[PDB]
Design a protein around this ligand. Sequence first.
Ligand SMILES: [Cl-]
Ligand SMILES: [Cl-]
Lengths: 98, 97
Amino acid sequence: ADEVTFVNRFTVHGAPAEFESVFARTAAFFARQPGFVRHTLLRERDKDNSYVAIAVWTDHDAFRRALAQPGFLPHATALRALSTSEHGLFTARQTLPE
Amino acid sequence: DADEVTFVNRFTVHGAPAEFESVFARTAAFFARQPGFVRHTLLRERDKDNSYVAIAVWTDHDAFRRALAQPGFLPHATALRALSTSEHGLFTARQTL
Ligand SMILES: [Cl-]
Ligand SMILES: [Cl-]
């Protein structure tokens, strides 16, 4: 649609359990932001410490409003503490089924 | 294992993006006829014309491997290898809201 997809690759350095906890609470916060559509956390099969998150928002503006929230900052901080992140924003060009 | 698998593949496109997308649409269409195909998305990084991520979901690791092993995959792997460089990983979904 007009919808953007945030993809975030995490290299987790500490305990994966602790990382997934910190993540869940991050996910919870975004889940109640206007324009939120969905979120997936992925774990790489042949590693303990590789992860990928995927967040869909209705539009760019909805997403940037969610990031500029003062409520997001402690989640951001906790994640940085526990992981190296390489992230980016995408559009969907082809989807199937659909 | 028995777990749902999400294949994630990063592409840098060196040839025409238009021809890359078209080849991909056919490739997705081929995947769509394979047992255990759940879904497929092709993403493009915003304000980059050459950076793509393809996300393919399969009911398990074996259905995915068997898709890639089919003779009819060969022309689609060939077309993409001529157009792009790529790095992939095999994942399992942990959370979803
Ligand atoms: Cl483990
Ligand atoms: Cl690459």
